[PDB]
Amino acid sequence: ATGDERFYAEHLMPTLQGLLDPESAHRLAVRFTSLGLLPRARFQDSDMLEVRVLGHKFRNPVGIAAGFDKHGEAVDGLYKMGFGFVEIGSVTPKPQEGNPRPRVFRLPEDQAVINRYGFNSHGLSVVEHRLRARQQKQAKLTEDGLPLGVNLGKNKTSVDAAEDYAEGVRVLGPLADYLVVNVSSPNTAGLRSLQGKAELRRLLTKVLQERDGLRRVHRPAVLVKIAPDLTSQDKEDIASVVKELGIDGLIVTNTTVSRPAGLQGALRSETGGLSGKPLRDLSTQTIREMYALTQGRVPIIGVGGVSSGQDALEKIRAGASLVQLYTALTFWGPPVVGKVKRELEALLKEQGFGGVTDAIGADHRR
Ligand SMILES: Cc1cc2nc3c(=O)[nH]c(=O)nc-3n(C[C@H](O)[C@H](O)[C@H](O)COP(=O)(O)O)c2cc1C
Ligand SMILES: COC(=O)/C(C)=C/CC/C(C)=C/Cc1c(O)c(Cl)c(C)c(C=O)c1O
Ligand SMILES: O=C(O)c1cc(=O)[nH]c(=O)[nH]1
Numbered sequence: 001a002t003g004d005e006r007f008y009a010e011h012l013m014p015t016l017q018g019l020l021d022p023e024s025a026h027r028l029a030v031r032f033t034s035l036g037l038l039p040r041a042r043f044q045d046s047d048m049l050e051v052r053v054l055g056h057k058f059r060n061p062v063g064i065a066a067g068f069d070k071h072g073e074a075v076d077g078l079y080k081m082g083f084g085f086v087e088i089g090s091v092t093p094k095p096q097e098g099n100p101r102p103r104v105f106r107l108p109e110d111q112a113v114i115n116r117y118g119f120n121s122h123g124l125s126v127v128e129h130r131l132r133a134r135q136q137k138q139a140k141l142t143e144d145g146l147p148l149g150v151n152l153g154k155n156k157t158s159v160d161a162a163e164d165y166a167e168g169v170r171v172l173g174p175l176a177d178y179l180v181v182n183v184s185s186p187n188t189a190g191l192r193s194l195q196g197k198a199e200l201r202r203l204l205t206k207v208l209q210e211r212d213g214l215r216r217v218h219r220p221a222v223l224v225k226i227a228p229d230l231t232s233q234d235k236e237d238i239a240s241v242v243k244e245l246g247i248d249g250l251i252v253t254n255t256t257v258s259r260p261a262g263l264q265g266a267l268r269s270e271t272g273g274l275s276g277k278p279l280r281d282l283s284t285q286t287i288r289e290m291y292a293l294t295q296g297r298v299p300i301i302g303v304g305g306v307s308s309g310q311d312a313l314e315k316i317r318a319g320a321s322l323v324q325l326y327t328a329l330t331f332w333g334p335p336v337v338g339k340v341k342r343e344l345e346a347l348l349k350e351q352g353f354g355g356v357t358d359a360i361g362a363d364h365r366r
Helices: 003-019 022-035 075-081 124-132 135-143 161-175 191-195 197-212 232-245 277-293 309-318 327-332 335-350
Strands: 051-053 056-058 062-064 085-091 104-107 112-115 148-152 178-182 221-226 249-252 273-276 300-303 322-325
Touching: 003 022, 003 327, 003 335, 022 075, 022 104, 022 327, 062 335, 075 085, 075 135, 085 124, 085 178, 112 277, 112 327, 124 135, 124 161, 135 148, 148 161, 161 178, 161 197, 178 197, 191 197, 197 221, 197 232, 221 232, 232 277, 249 277, 273 277, 273 327, 277 300, 277 309, 300 309, 309 322, 309 335, 322 327, 322 335, 327 335
Parallel strands: 062 085, 062 322, 085 148, 148 178, 178 221, 221 249, 249 300, 300 322
Antiparallel strands: 051 056, 104 112, 112 273
16 A cells, blocks of 8 residues: 555545535545646556457546546546546536535545535536547547546436437537436436336437437447436346347446435435445445346446445456446545555456456356
């Protein structure tokens, strides 16, 4: 372990969190990232960490989850942190404010966060222009194993959900290596009902048609991001639709509306999605289920409570080809990225895997 890891985790981050309200801290973190006010990412990615999936090379399998850089303001700073891929968003078609403040809450005793942002978004046009300003820089990054994902949401007041996602595909699809159809935010009324079989098939047919209409060089993979709170029936239905339509992958999972027994944080009963440690194993089990239901043939990006190499490898062994983290960054700061990667490499060696690829879904073959 490094001096920076300890300094950030034990001193700098908790001291600053003591001084800054959650959303102010989030805004400052985005600003610091965009400005490159970041510690040295000392860890060099080994060949063992490379993954080929979704029509792309990923230099390492650790990405930043959606919701950190909602508006595509900090993409390059996120690569400088050592993330193998960056996901921005969620982005809505029209700009919208989201919910009133406060709308993000720390649960320090649980290493968790609850948020009810409600898709605060600069909107498609602003994000489009932001991504266009660095489009060729991104093309080079992608070629060098550092892909970009764009996560799409829907406006609060929109009368046609499928048309919102279609607009996102048309506007940001040409700027993305992959798109995410986010049907799992707990903070937009009626959104999670789009995970239902009939609604999902209709929505995804339209999304895929719009994607297929993009020029070849500008044609992204399409993934669906799902909740950790689905019934067994819901999961069976999603797997069926994914296979029927040839959806490129799944992101598993969004935040939970559950409140696991044992939460200690004073703010545990705030409305919103819960992330971090209490979500971890619920998310891992959802990855495990979805991998089995799709016969290991559908790439999964595993997300929820990853804060160590062990957390990452558990999701990989459960069936994730790639992982993301967010809440761990909020507690431990930028050095957490190198920590996860270093620990993951060590564990892969210890468990006799030649690399990440060999470990994907390994628990299912035990
Ligand atoms: C403050 C906050 C905002 C988020 N915003 C989004 C979002 O806009 N779109 C999305 O798909 N997921 C969003 N998420 C969910 C994360 O992408 C991720 O699925 C979830 O937090 C679990 O990972 P973690 O435990 O590493 O944070 C957000 C999470 C947090 C904590
Ligand atoms: C990348 O940011 C940094 O390196 C530093 C030192 C940021 C200072 C502000 C800070 C202590 C942020 C921690 C924090 C938070 O405390 C909370 Cl609650 C959230 C939601 C986020 C979202 O990114 C978050 O980053
Ligand atoms: O904007 C939000 O509230 C949000 C979206 C999402 O998909 N997940 C989440 O936890 N929050």
